[PDB]
Write an enzyme that holds these catalytic residues in place. Structure first.
Site, PDB file in Angstrom:
ATOM      1  N   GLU A  85     -15.799 -11.965   4.026  1.00 38.68           N
ATOM      2  CA  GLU A  85     -14.626 -11.841   3.164  1.00 38.68           C
ATOM      3  C   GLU A  85     -14.004 -13.203   2.873  1.00 38.68           C
ATOM      4  OE1 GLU A  85     -11.529  -9.415   4.777  1.00 38.68           O
ATOM      5  OE2 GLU A  85     -10.399  -9.393   2.894  1.00 38.68           O
ATOM      6  N   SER A 122      -7.281   1.012  -2.679  1.00 41.92           N
ATOM      7  CA  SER A 122      -6.138   0.239  -3.130  1.00 41.92           C
ATOM      8  C   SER A 122      -6.552  -1.149  -3.593  1.00 41.92           C
ATOM      9  CB  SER A 122      -5.112   0.131  -2.004  1.00 41.92           C
ATOM     10  OG  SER A 122      -4.343  -1.052  -2.121  1.00 41.92           O
ATOM     11  N   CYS A 133      -8.331  -2.385   5.801  1.00 41.69           N
ATOM     12  CA  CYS A 133      -8.600  -3.809   5.670  1.00 41.69           C
ATOM     13  C   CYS A 133     -10.044  -4.162   6.000  1.00 41.69           C
ATOM     14  CB  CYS A 133      -7.662  -4.609   6.579  1.00 41.69           C
ATOM     15  SG  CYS A 133      -6.567  -3.603   7.598  1.00 41.69           S
ATOM     16  N   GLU A 155       1.914   1.711  -3.514  1.00 42.25           N
ATOM     17  CA  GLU A 155       0.871   2.275  -4.370  1.00 42.25           C
ATOM     18  C   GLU A 155       0.635   3.752  -4.070  1.00 42.25           C
ATOM     19  OE1 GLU A 155      -2.832   0.165  -4.243  1.00 42.25           O
ATOM     20  OE2 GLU A 155      -3.682   1.308  -5.916  1.00 42.25           O
ATOM     21  N   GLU A 180       0.818  -1.207   0.000  1.00 42.72           N
ATOM     22  CA  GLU A 180       0.000   0.000   0.000  1.00 42.72           C
ATOM     23  C   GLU A 180       0.854   1.260   0.000  1.00 42.72           C
ATOM     24  OE1 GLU A 180      -4.359  -0.782   2.153  1.00 42.72           O
ATOM     25  OE2 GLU A 180      -2.463  -1.052   3.225  1.00 42.72           O
ATOM     26  N   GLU A 236     -13.373 -15.053  -4.755  1.00 44.68           N
ATOM     27  CA  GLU A 236     -12.124 -14.514  -5.280  1.00 44.68           C
ATOM     28  C   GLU A 236     -10.937 -15.005  -4.469  1.00 44.68           C
ATOM     29  OE1 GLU A 236     -10.731 -11.849  -7.650  1.00 44.68           O
ATOM     30  OE2 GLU A 236     -12.188 -13.080  -8.750  1.00 44.68           O
ATOM     31  N   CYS A 278     -10.988  -2.115  14.718  1.00 45.71           N
ATOM     32  CA  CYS A 278     -11.258  -3.535  14.910  1.00 45.71           C
ATOM     33  C   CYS A 278     -11.268  -3.925  16.381  1.00 45.71           C
ATOM     34  CB  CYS A 278     -10.227  -4.365  14.147  1.00 45.71           C
ATOM     35  SG  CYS A 278     -10.145  -3.977  12.389  1.00 45.71           S
ATOM     36  N   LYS A 319     -15.285 -10.271   8.309  1.00 47.56           N
ATOM     37  CA  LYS A 319     -14.173 -11.121   7.906  1.00 47.56           C
ATOM     38  C   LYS A 319     -14.658 -12.510   7.514  1.00 47.56           C
ATOM     39  CE  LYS A 319     -10.837  -8.231   8.132  1.00 47.56           C
ATOM     40  NZ  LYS A 319     -10.208  -7.809   6.850  1.00 47.56           N
TER      41      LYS A 319
END
Ligand code: 402
Ligand code: 402
Ligand code: SF4
Ligand code: SF4
Ligand code: SF4
Ligand code: SF4
Ligand code: SF4
Ligand code: SF4
Ligand SMILES: [Cl-]
Ligand SMILES: [Cl-]
Ligand SMILES: [Cl-]
Ligand SMILES: [Cl-]
Ligand SMILES: [Cl-]
Ligand SMILES: [Cl-]
Ligand SMILES: [Cl-]
Ligand SMILES: [Cl-]
Ligand SMILES: [Cl-]
Ligand SMILES: [Cl-]
Ligand SMILES: [Zn+2]
Ligand SMILES: [Zn+2]
Lengths: 621, 618
Positions: free
Chosen positions: A411, A369, A349, A326, A323, A416, A553, A408
């Site tokens: 996710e 990102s 995240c 980027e 990151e 993917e 979190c 999570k």
């Protein structure tokens, strides 16, 4: 080892070992004239009051009893030669498919280690059975599977010269449930984590807290009318679950699968744990908020049967490498007058912003990102590199994530992050779930010896650990990127401007010729405020951070309920993470030797083609 | 072995060029100093050079870098193999590398090159990765894996240029496109192709008028687009386009590659209506049954087993007549839970037609699969198993008259572990062009028999291909079983005819049934609107999307002369095949009965539902 109970307990003549869906699993002395039901009652009935479904006799081999044997004398003849005299009791709350997957994998392990060479001939066949079950559990099957299973069962019964194969009777007695799973893609017990969606159940009383708490107005319903979730707009922020006075909202519970995987012989189980777990779990065992008990958690997990314990903060350091790369690239392009570039860059995240943007900010899809989350980065590295080095196929390793939220889970459920039906994160466990596992299993974190986290993927810096509280992700990215861009090592690495507790925070960071404007939000309403300001041009930002939960979190809905002032406890956890950061010699992600080894040996530099292939993903395809 | 678009099967100083060159074949190559293709006649169309494989089992891989520069003759590697596969910009690299890997694996497995044994699984894994890309179930990570796999092989083969590495380096764009955008820019990956209007569209509005469901939006000359969420895949738009602007793929090249893969089992099924229209391309009249000519031609192409879809149609009739008998018995018994009419049709086009416009009639259609998918599932789960072949070791090819069958075979419900029961579909026109370019003339070749186990069929099955045949067969069987009487005259002329919407009134013993038939989705809409309004009551219905039934499919050869006359000739040709058959009820076929006696044990059993039934409208 062996053991199972909903509140979870891995319990390591006329004596039997009951470990099913019964209250108080243990070793019991059976009275002479006794039915199955009476044995169940001597153990206190089944968790909740779900009625008896079945009882397995002998884990490798034995009989399979259903209601028809409940009120009949328990003939010990079912304990044939050297069965070890074990009973797994099932209630209506257990999915047959997951249980039969566990049975088949156990049998396969005992075949593969040579204990049951006489069954070797059926190995391949039985493997296929498991595969079929797996295809059912992931929802990628047709009804034809049943046909196949039957023949496979028949095949086994032919080669073993056995009068009763288990799978035939299983099919006959639970055809309805199997057909439900296949055609309706539904597991009525919610044990199949890949078939469960966040839903409001029939118990709901039409109170309303969830309708008020949702930041995106995703829930419809009035008065006592049952409320429903518009799943196409749900961010999985978990506010509705936390606000519900009851069990009306379910997103699954992967505890039993964890126990079964731990109880499978010669099965490699590895874990990662989120930065914020280690400062909150200890609250359930007599520690104050903010106290780092990561070594206690490691010792407890290893006691449960985990073979390797790793850390998500390693993945957070890797995420920072990507990151910061980027962000620097985007800043360099912007300063050069490149209008193809897009600012700000979003570093977070948290999955909750994904849909949050897709559904309200389609003009900012190029902002976030492309880097994966630390959880998925850890998982992909563990399975595609770490396991490969150790000569293990990806399905020979079970990667379990210990995280503070359900987002999570969603996710880790995303396709993917999988290949050939193997999900990088096999399943997710919440902090509360692990707390209950420890409590019912006799693991007391206050009194257990410290144990170290494994090195290759457990070592982490303070930049990574601050991820768990608001402002940490952007703080770490900024540290690395500014040090990279100026060539200057900062005397004071803490950026107090990015810290604080206001819902929407603005900071201005100056270093040499480089000047950055940063926006931080925790709470999706504050995030909406910030993004509306950006779109209107009211404020300009180089980078932003968005967290759905207040405090980050450490404030996730999967964390233990706070004691006393909620805000004070959340601040204590955040400062605990900050103090972990301050106690580390290395406080920039780019100083971690193991992440650098990842780059030097496999990906060869951040943002390379290999780095994009492995550690990056496409949000908003 | 051979391969080229528009088809070919070409079954020292010597070279064999078989790529995308016009006029494939061996070629005395001169020793004089890009224009190499021109000596072979250039490339199909005028598509630019992409790459050239040297040696089919193993060799070198040449790219554009050698195009306009001195093409060194001696660089042909000592193991040149005297064969060259040239690639144009119209070839997908993923399919070519899959074909290369499968050829190499076959030649390893037969012992021709034991020195490569060590890499077998490695190379195999590469194929699987490629397959996942072609089926669209992959992330970018696959590339990473491929790289390392390549690196491994090149170490053990001690190769100076490994083929997979150069593939990744030079065609990274295409791979990333395939994976992230789920797009194959050459449209060779049939599972990534959707029915689409290309850039050649000028905005005629012919597509918007021809569509019976109003699936196309657009005004003026602006490019038109298909709302795929309502498309019935009836194929009217493709036939109506003045240009080739609408493409739905063409699996000809994949069929050729699979036929050219050594030790690969390729089997085929063919729809009833193909056999009365294909011969038109070779001088036959409409209605002439040339099924034996087709079998002989397919075997000449390299097909190892030739079967018939009408066997699957007989099985479908067994199941559907069973369901109709059950439903009628329940209705006569006063069961109001039952649904009438029952729809009998293997045409997929009604599915979307109903789900999007007749959601009050989802319980009408039978749960029975189509004959095509029944054949595919039986071939892979029983026939292959009987012959000891895994489903991936058998390639089942369906020759059908329409594009809707391509989309049906592409449906994930008819697959397992990424293996599709119908691997891919070939249209009648595509097979015609295959035969034409390969020198196969159906009017000039010997007859050959269709394979028996899954090829024998009755007239009830064969009449499926024209309007009214499916319901006629179902009625034949169901009424004969319900009354116990064998009919002296099995033909129901009332169900025949050519009207878009036909009504029939059938009497047998105590049984009186009312039947509705429609061909053309607009006439079907009329009929279903009448049913919904209660203006008419029906016990059963048949719906065909194309006029005349499948004999009028868009994949059939364009009619010569009067269109209606030709379609009627084909339909009566099928009826005459029925009249020439000793067996004219699906329930008399010994092989279908064997299917029931040995595996499924009776129609509508649990096993029969598991294999031969599906859930429309999940
Ligand atoms: N992935 C990730 Fe994160 C990291 O690192 C966790 O693991 Fe968080 C924590 N603690 C959780 O849950 S997610 C949101 N970003 C802040 S921290
Ligand atoms: N499946 C099927 Fe059919 C059968 O039998 C074919 O194969 Fe047809 C034909 N001919 C085609 O295409 S589909 C529609 N039902 C009528 S017939
Ligand atoms: S909170 Fe729980 S109960 Fe109150 S409404 Fe939302 S769901 Fe129904
Ligand atoms: S999760 Fe967050 S968003 Fe989805 S419903 Fe519950 S509250 Fe609304
Ligand atoms: S913030 Fe709350 S929700 Fe967003 S990730 Fe961390 S825990 Fe899960
Ligand atoms: S060409 Fe076919 S698609 Fe393009 S406009 Fe004319 S009709 Fe519509
Ligand atoms: S296919 Fe049939 S339905 Fe789909 S668009 Fe072309 S015409 Fe309209
Ligand atoms: S009628 Fe037969 S051919 Fe025409 S579309 Fe429906 S199925 Fe395909
Ligand atoms: Cl078994
Ligand atoms: Cl969920
Ligand atoms: Cl273990
Ligand atoms: Cl490693
Ligand atoms: Cl350590
Ligand atoms: Cl909390
Ligand atoms: Cl062949
Ligand atoms: Cl024959
Ligand atoms: Cl036609
Ligand atoms: Cl049987
Ligand atoms: Zn289940
Ligand atoms: Zn392709």
């Amino acid at each position: 080892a062996l053991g199972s109970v909903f509140s979870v307990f891995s319990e390591e003549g006329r004596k039997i070992a009951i470990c099913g869906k019964v209250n108080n699993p243990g070793i019991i002395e059976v009275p002479e004239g006794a039915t199955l039901n009476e044995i169940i009652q001597l153990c206190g009935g089944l968790i909740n009051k779900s009625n008896f479904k079945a009882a397995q006799i002998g884990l490798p081999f034995g009989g399979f009893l259903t209601e028809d044997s409940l009120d009949k004398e328990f003939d010990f003849g079912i304990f044939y030669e050297n069965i070890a005299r074990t009973i797994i009791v099932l209630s209506q709350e257990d999915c047959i498919i997951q249980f039969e997957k566990f049975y088949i994998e156990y049998l396969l392990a005992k075949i593969k280690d040579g204990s049951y060479k006489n069954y070797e001939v059926v190995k391949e066949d039985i493997t296929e059975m498991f595969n079929i079950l797996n295809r059912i559990s992931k929802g990628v099957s047709n009804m034809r599977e049943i046909y196949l299973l039957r023949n496979l069962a028949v095949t086994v019964k032919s080669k073993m010269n056995q009068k009763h194969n288990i799978m035939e009777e299983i099919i006959d007695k639970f055809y309805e449930e199997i057909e439900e799973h296949i055609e309706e893609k539904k597991c009525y017990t919610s044990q199949c984590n890949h078939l469960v969606k966040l839903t409001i159940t029939k118990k709901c009383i039409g109170c309303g807290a969830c309708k008020r708490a949702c930041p995106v107005d995703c829930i419809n319903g009035e008065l006592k009318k049952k409320h429903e979730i518009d799943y196409n707009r749900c961010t999985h922020c978990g506010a509705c679950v936390s606000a519900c006075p009851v069990d009306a909202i379910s997103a699954g519970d992967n505890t039993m699968l964890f126990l079964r995987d731990l109880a499978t012989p010669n099965k490699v189980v590895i874990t990662q744990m989120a930065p914020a777990v280690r400062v909150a779990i200890g609250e359930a065992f007599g520690f104050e908020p903010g106290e780092n008990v990561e070594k206690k958690i490691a010792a407890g997990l290893r006691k449960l049967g985990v073979d390797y314990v790793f850390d998500t903060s390693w993945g957070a350091d890797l995420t920072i490498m990507e990151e910061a790369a980027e962000l620097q690239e985007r800043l360099e392009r912007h300063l050069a007058g490149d209008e193809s570039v897009k600012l700000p860059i979003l570093t977070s995240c948290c999955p909750s912003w994904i849909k949050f943007i897709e559904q309200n900010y389609g003009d900012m899809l190029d902002v976030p990102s492309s880097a994966k989350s630390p959880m998925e980065m850890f998982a992909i590295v563990a399975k595609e590199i770490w396991a490969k080095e150790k000569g293990l196929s990806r399905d020979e390793v079970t990667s379990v994530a210990i995280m503070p939220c359900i987002a999570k889970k969603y996710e880790a459920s995303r396709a993917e992050f999988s290949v050939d039906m193997n999900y990088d994160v096999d399943y997710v466990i919440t902090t509360r779930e692990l707390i209950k596992i420890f409590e019912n299993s006799g693991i007391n974190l206050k009194e257990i010896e410290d144990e170290e986290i494994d090195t290759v993927m457990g070592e982490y810096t303070g930049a990574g650990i601050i991820f768990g509280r608001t402002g940490g992700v952007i703080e770490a990215a900024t540290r690395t990127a500014l040090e990279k861009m100026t060539g200057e090592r900062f005397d004071n690495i803490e950026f107090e401007g990015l810290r604080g507790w206001d819902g929407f925070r603005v900071c201005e960071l100056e270093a040499g010729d480089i000047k950055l404007r940063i926006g931080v939000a925790h709470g999706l309403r504050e995030a909406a405020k910030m993004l509306d300001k950006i779109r209107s041009g009211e404020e300009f930002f180089h980078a932003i951070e968005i967290m759905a939960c207040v405090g980050g979190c450490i404030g996730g809905g999967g964390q233990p309920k706070t004691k006393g002032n909620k805000q004070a406890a959340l601040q204590k956890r955040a400062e605990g993470l900050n103090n972990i950061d301050r106690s580390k010699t290395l406080r920039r992600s780019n100083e971690n030797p193991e992440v650098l080894a990842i780059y030097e040996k496999y990906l060869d530099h951040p943002l390379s083609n290999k780095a994009h292939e492995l550690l990056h993903t496409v949000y908003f395809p």
